[PDB]
């Protein structure tokens, strides 16, 4: 997260870290057994880390649980990033408490100008690289689809939206992929892609979760 702020330990209790001997992507806990992340975050050997603040120190409140299923959307296109969503089933149910909690799925899509919370352990620099120990947070509005398409002509599908700023300085970045965009207590977005990070006129692009609520439901119920 570039241009954000330290969230505070366990203030985003649905935020998870996906770990393969290092933090590689974020995700969101949606019930005791299931995590939503990005399809492009798929790999073998995923350990889900819940209740994290400092990802480099065992502080208390962590739960490390292996992924038992990693389900990429069958129509995920790695060329266009359309359908950039993945479901991870945990080996054992997480213990839910104040510091480890699920986030609600949307009942409807969000509108332009809705203010959302984007969070992660990604790069904090727009130029070069700095990775934080603790979780970072950013408040960011959903942009109009006209403005989103103007920024990225021919590249924004019905399953994507833009959020953030056009003036530069505030954005999600490398290492934040798969993590949450939460608006009015609903998981509306998944950190997906963009042109660089926090660059003028290049807002972040996010998977539009409201389009997948039925798929998520049908997939969990059958697994």
């Amino acid at each position: 997260i570039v241009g954000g702020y330290t969230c505070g330990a366990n203030t985003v209790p649905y935020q998870v870290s996906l770990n393969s001997g290092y933090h590689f992507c974020g995700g969101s806990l949606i019930n005791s057994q299931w995590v939503v992340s990005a399809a492009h975050c798929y790999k073998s050997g995923i350990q889900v880390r819940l209740g994290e603040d400092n990802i480099n120190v065992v502080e208390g409140n962590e739960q490390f649980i292996s992924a038992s299923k990693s389900i990429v959307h069958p129509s995920y296109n790695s060329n266009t990033l359309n359908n950039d969503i993945m479901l991870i089933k945990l080996k054992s149910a997480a213990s839910l408490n104040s510091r480890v909690a699920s986030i609600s799925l949307p009942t409807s899509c969000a509108s332009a100008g809705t203010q959302c919370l984007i969070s992660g352990w990604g790069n904090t620099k727009s130029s070069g690289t700095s990775y934080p120990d603790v979780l970072k947070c950013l408040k960011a509005p959903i942009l109009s689809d006209s403005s989103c398409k103007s920024a990225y002509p021919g590249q924004i599908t019905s399953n994507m939206f833009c959020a953030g700023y056009l003036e530069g300085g505030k954005d999600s970045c490398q290492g934040d992929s798969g993590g949450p965009v939460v608006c009015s207590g609903k998981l509306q977005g998944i950190v997906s892609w963009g042109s660089g990070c926090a660059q003028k006129n290049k807002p972040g692009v996010y998977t539009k979760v409201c389009n997948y609520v039925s798929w998520i439901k049908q997939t969990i119920a059958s697994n």
Partner: peptide, 10 residues
């Protein structure tokens, strides 16, 4: 344009 992962660029 890149994904925001440990990046996949185009």
């Amino acid at each position: 344009r890149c994904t925001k992962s440990x990046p996949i660029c185009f």
